[PDB]
């Protein structure tokens, strides 16, 4: 909302910058953040498998 571009190929940053308000769609962001904090690699593969 301020006019700043955020270009990132990682799915974690994309899910964090999306700002989802759905109660059921927040489960993907949680597991993505957990995977990024654990090893920080396959952030989109887990979402695709789910």
């Amino acid at each position: 909302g301020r006019g700043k571009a955020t270009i990132s190929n990682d799915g974690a940053t994309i899910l964090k910058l999306l700002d989802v308000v759905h109660p059921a769609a927040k489960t993907l962001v949680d597991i993505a953040k957990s995977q990024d904090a654990e090893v920080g690699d396959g952030t989109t593969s887990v979402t695709l498998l789910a």
Binding site: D19, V20, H22, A25
Partner: protein, 525 residues
């Protein structure tokens, strides 16, 4: 009944686009930007005019300054502005050429994208072609010598780089001034310079031909007393930091006076310390002291009686510039002012301008100083800024030349040779990647075409003639005759450019093209 569910916050206001339309819009925006920033290329190009937010008028042709004050809102335009700013901060010469090359490369890749080629393969082919061009450009490179006696190649390059601005009527002297400032502040033992040492100051009034080099330090202040002598022939600089006031600690001190004796002792000690510091200023042998803060009345009267001029309000870099040029040391107090910590002054005399009340003091006839000042004079406000920008560009060009200690032949021959080498190397690439190399070679020839268009001749015909003359003979120094001199050889026309600058420009353009070809999404409110 499929009830719509709320996913993203404020979904009824934002807009989402696929990817192909976004890429097409970005390519169109880049092409429009390249077409807008195209007339300001070459010696025949004109200048631009910008309007500030309040109402200021700025006329320049540096390219980066025009894009910095463009006020856009399309991201890609902001990215191009940031790229031009980074190029100007790194090299300094050629701010719009890189964005023109990027726009041409994007326009050439648009055809391959519409045909049916993956953007990753196009980016890989463009990177390979850029690497081949970079490896080929260093083969036709010539090394020059740098010394304090022969300053012909540097002057020629400074005249060639400053041959497209409006100050070309006096760039003959500006190039000499720039090369003299560079030779003064060279620092060959470490191969680096310092822009903070060169003071670039300008003032309205006068003529453009009055620009000269001063091997000293100039200030915008006057003397503390109007009856003080203006000009001096033999004086010593006494740099001081503490003011001409009685000492006062920064802590919380309280002086208690309970009788007449204490008040009398304080009144006597005040003048005693005043006379002591006045004698200490005189006993050091200096004839002109320099402080930092304000003075007073009794101190000024004693200085006038003892015949000793002084300059007030010089807390900025003027003290450092004087200490560097004159070589004198800086003392925090008056008791440490010795005879060895004094700077030698040659000629300290203020100058008067027109009918205004502005007086500036300038020091000259110094020793082996490492800092010089550039005085710019003109009749307009934007003229001084344009001259300062041209001087900065020339200084950056000379710095890059000293760092690279080698030059090349630009103008309109290096790009043609690179395109020819890319086209020749593309003939032995039958792995589908030959389409990107041809596009890179076709987009690389956008500089001679633009030069011929700005000159006033046939672009394609002149380009074909230059290519034929280069492929028939053996000399990669045939460019575009923009000044209409007859011969097309750039070796005798004194056209000298840069090699590392062109390499960095090509690499940055290729990286920006690869980055733009990767983006294919947008989510703006």
């Amino acid at each position: 009944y499929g009830r719509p569910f709320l996913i993203i916050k404020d979904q009824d206001r934002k807009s989402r686009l696929m990817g192909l339309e976004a890429l097409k819009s970005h390519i169109m925006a880049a092409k429009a930007v390249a077409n807008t920033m195209r007339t300001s290329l070459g010696p025949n190009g004109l200048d631009k005019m910008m309007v500030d937010k309040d109402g200021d008028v700025t006329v320049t042709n540096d390219g980066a300054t025009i894009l910095s004050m463009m006020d856009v809102d399309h991201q890609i335009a902001k990215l191009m502005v940031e790229l031009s700013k980074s190029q100007d901060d790194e090299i300094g010469d050629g701010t719009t050429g890189v964005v023109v090359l990027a726009g041409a490369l994007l326009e050439e890749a648009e055809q391959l994208l519409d045909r049916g080629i993956h953007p990753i393969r196009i980016a890989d082919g463009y990177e390979q072609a850029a690497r081949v061009a970079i490896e080929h450009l260093d083969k036709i490179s010539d090394s020059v010598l740098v010394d304090i006696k022969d300053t012909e190649p540097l002057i020629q390059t400074a005249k060639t780089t400053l041959g497209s601005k409006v100050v070309n009527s006096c760039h003959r002297q500006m190039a000499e001034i720039a090369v003299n400032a560079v030779l003064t502040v060279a620092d060959m033992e470490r191969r680096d310079v310092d822009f903070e040492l060169i003071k670039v100051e300008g003032k309205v009034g006068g003529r453009l031909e009055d620009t000269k080099l001063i091997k000293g330090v100039i200030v915008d202040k006057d003397f503390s007393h109007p009856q003080m002598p203006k000009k001096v022939e033999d004086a010593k600089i006494a740099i001081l930091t503490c003011p001409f006031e009685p000492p006062k600690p920064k802590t919380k001190h309280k002086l208690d006076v309970t009788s007449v004796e204490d008040y009398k002792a304080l009144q006597k000690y005040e003048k005693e310390k005043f006379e002591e510091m006045i004698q200490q200023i005189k006993e050091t042998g200096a004839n002109l002291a320099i402080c930092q803060w304000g003075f007073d009345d009794e101190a000024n009267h004693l200085l006038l009686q003892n015949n000793l001029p002084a300059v007030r309000w010089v807390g900025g870099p003027e003290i450092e510039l004087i200490a560097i040029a004159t070589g004198g040391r800086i003392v925090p107090r008056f008791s440490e002012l010795t005879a060895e910590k004094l700077g030698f002054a040659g000629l300290v005399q203020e100058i008067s301008f027109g009918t205004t009340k502005d007086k500036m003091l300038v020091i000259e006839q110094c020793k082996n100083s490492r800092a010089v000042t550039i005085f710019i004079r003109g009749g307009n406000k934007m003229i001084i800024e344009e001259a300062k920008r041209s001087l900065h560009d020339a200084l950056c060009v000379i710095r890059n030349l000293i760092r690279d200690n080698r030059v090349v032949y630009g103008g309109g021959a290096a790009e043609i040779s690179c395109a020819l080498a890319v086209s020749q190397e593309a003939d032995k690439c039958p792995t589908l990647e030959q389409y990107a190399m041809r596009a890179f070679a076709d987009a690389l020839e956008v500089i001679p075409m633009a030069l011929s268009e700005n000159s006033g001749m046939n672009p394609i015909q002149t380009m074909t003639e230059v290519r034929a003359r280069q492929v028939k003979e053996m000399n990669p120094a045939l460019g575009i005759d923009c000044l209409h001199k007859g011969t097309n050889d750039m070796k005798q026309q004194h056209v000298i450019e840069t090699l590392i600058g062109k390499k960095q420009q090509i690499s940055l353009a290729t990286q920006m093209v690869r980055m733009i070809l990767k983006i294919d999404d947008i989510r703006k409110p």
